[PDB]
Symmetry: D3
Subunit: 157 residues, 6 copies
């Protein structure tokens, strides 16, 4: 059973590590898929985001980190994935997630969207909030893997 966990991961946070770890306890192979997302004008290049996520997930044996610029559904078909994982923090996320999931089902009906809920510890964070705090020199060590925190410090230095 192959699952894809797609996202912008700009950068990957402890909330993302929490979701992917839960995914590996459920499915045999997990593809952590980083979308290029140019419309979002990401802080880190796709190459950087892939490198950060690879290092941050090295301890999880059945995680493969890959980048993509393709349509989500086509990339999942090309990875032979039948499960699409997304983390759900609150009601605000739930509405937008439904649109993407119904569109993905329209484009690939055999690809099942599944939602997981992060730990209470990471239920109020996002890449956007972590970047906002770090842009103002606020301490975000608690929310990011060690290698990611270093890269975010270095990127803003």
């Amino acid at each position: 059973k192959r699952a894809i966990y797609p996202g912008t991961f700009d950068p990957i946070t402890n909330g993302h590590i929490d979701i992917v770890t839960r995914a590996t306890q459920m499915f045999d192979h997990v593809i952590l898929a980083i979308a290029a997302s140019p419309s979002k004008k990401p802080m880190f290049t796709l190459e950087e985001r892939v490198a950060l996520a690879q290092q941050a997930t090295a301890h999880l044996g059945n995680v493969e980190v890959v980048g993509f610029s393709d349509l989500m559904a086509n990339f999942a078909r090309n990875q032979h994935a039948t499960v699409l994982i997304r983390g759900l923090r609150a009601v605000a996320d739930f509405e937008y997630e439904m649109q993407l999931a119904h569109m993905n089902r329209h484009l690939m009906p055999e690809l099942e969207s599944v939602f997981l809920m992060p730990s209470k510890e990471w239920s109020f964070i996002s890449s956007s909030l972590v970047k906002e705090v770090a842009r103002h020199q606020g301490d975000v060590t608690h929310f990011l893997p060690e290698n990611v925190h270093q890269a975010l410090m270095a990127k803003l230095a």
Copy 2:
């Protein structure tokens, strides 16, 4: 991995929305237990025996579904059934706040049990057993939302 999943609910009665969710669950997990709550928080329209037989007939075509009644917490039932996945259906009209309370409480009770939210077809995204029962009790047409056996049992129940 040989995953066992539970799909708990009152299923009073089981609807096409519940059939859609359990079918999706059988496509991703090796064994699915459709778990029917014995207890009435509010007194159910169908008895536990009626709810189980209706669900069995309606899922008989799905080879890896087992219909089982339970009277304990859904976390305690998952533990006793050696299930590590708890299926929750997430309709467009779900109480997302309650789902968050339930998932965090289930994780506290059984940390190794993972709550998995599945999405029904758009067709069943705006219905509930509660709404179906209200409509049927007030002489409205609900045939479209139910398996045929459930439609027949519901008409018989409302006739008497």
Copy 3:
């Protein structure tokens, strides 16, 4: 087009929020039926006869409003009254999820009936008959939220 609209509810009692909605509806549709549900999902404070008389007196100044009791589904009542519009009030504190369930169910029952959501004045956007009754039952001042006839009937009801 000579449109007939229904505005259903329990109106237990009718409030200034309901008056605001029905007034807005009379400004856009030729005939508005303020439709009062006979049934108690939960037992109502005022009887159906009391709810109808209060609503009639409170809307007497609106020439194209008819107050009518009904005991069937709001879709079945709309069909029998040859109404093609169903008015729903949408306060800031409405259960939008339930409104979606209700609208899709009404469309399933009567496809030609269109659910129309109207917005009350900001003044009445945070009240409900339920909240008004709780406040009044616990000796709080609710005069501001009610038509004068309703205020008089509510004080008489709570006195005994």
Copy 4:
């Protein structure tokens, strides 16, 4: 009775056609009003959006398609409209719609805002989602009128 159905319609989708069709079954004359919306940096010019909507609604006798850069409320007064139609898909839309409707009521109290709910078929789509999928060469034929789908393909070609 004259109703206005205003929006950016960048581009008009089957969800918009669903709403305007419902509006024509209720009101004698419906003005489908396309806002220029430069702040939103639209994909299609106002002239293109008007042309697409005109062709997409040609089968509906009592629909008039017009463009505007004016304040919403002033344009409705100038069209002699007393009804303002807006489609409501979910809770996320409902909150922003309330602000606009109360502002419109402040600017023109006789202009009644009315909300309609689209078919379940179009309850999870938006112009933004359709454009995102099409930018990644995903099939959106199901969600758009034929002429709109052609124009979106041609615009992205």
Copy 5:
């Protein structure tokens, strides 16, 4: 300014979430009254006398908290206690719509009373007394969510 604040609720039973909120309130206001509602909208598990004693023992370490029972509207109680601040806890799973209704109604009843929303620790953001009671009634472990005295009283209540 010598501010007096009330923190009303049914506290049936008082949980670690309520302790967190009242502790935060004592850090910003000079005197906090933890106000326990006497009335059963729904019949409470613990009697008013039980709810008051449990809350007193659980807040005994906070010098500026007074635990008091009341049977009137929370606005009327705030007025009689000369309180100008009404504390509301805002968990991640709160009914924000109801909180808005309540705040606007309290402002109508007592304009000088300001509703203040406090946020609990993430640890208690997904629990409620209602959920705690359901879990405990169905033999689940709730020790983590309660003060020790409450855990002991709840086990005794469920044993009989």
Copy 6:
């Protein structure tokens, strides 16, 4: 007892005046703190926003208007504030407010976030909506202090 009411205030509205007035009835000293917020590309400079808010709050004796580009939590520590005030209009605001409040608690646990609800009169307005209406020459006199309305007219003239 010292409270900070931070925000972009681009420009300050009657809804903001309502919140700060409520704050002064509760706390001895209130700091109305205007964040520079360059990421939001504000209409008014920080200097203009500070001047507008100073004039708009001159009648309130225990309000001090200050600008800042610092991390929120650091600025509150530096003002010796133990209370952080934020206005709550609806559910949509409530979710984002929770993230900021939990982040602020992580950065300064003694800084208590408190939420106040504005009057029904200002429950459906925002700086963004007022600017949108004014950009289209719509009347916004009802929603802004006199000096702010003049400045918004002059800025758009």
